[PDB]
Amino acid sequence: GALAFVDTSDCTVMNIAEHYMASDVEWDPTGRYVVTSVSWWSHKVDNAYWLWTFQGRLLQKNNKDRFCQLLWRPRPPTLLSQEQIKQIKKKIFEQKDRLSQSKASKE
C-alpha cells in the first residue's frame, strides 16, 4: 500500500499515509472519508483498518480479525438547492461548531 492525496487548484502531491494490510479504496457519499481497508482471504494477517482523512489526521484505529471491507451505507436522494451551497459560499458564520465541541471535550 502506497497512498497519496491529489488536491485541486493547485495540483500537488503532499502526503503519504502508510498502509500494510489494505487492498481497496472507496469514498463516502457525503465527502467525509476515503477508506483503505483489508481483506482476509486475499492476503496474510497483517491486519489493520486505516482510513484516509485529508488533513493528515487519523480517521480509523481498529483491528478486528478476518475483516473484509468497510464502505458507506448509502443515504436518500438529497434534492438539494443552489441557495444552501451559496450560504456555504459565503469562521464568518461557521464559528459555533468548534466552540460547542470544546465544551463537550472539557474535563
Binding site: D7, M14, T53, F54, Q55, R57, K91, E94, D97, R98
Partner: peptide, 10 residues
C-alpha cells in the same frame, strides 16, 4: 492553510 482548508470545509 491546508489544515485551514480542512477546517473551513468541515
Amino acid at each position: 492553510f491546508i489544515m485551514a482548508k480542512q477546517v473551513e470545509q468541515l
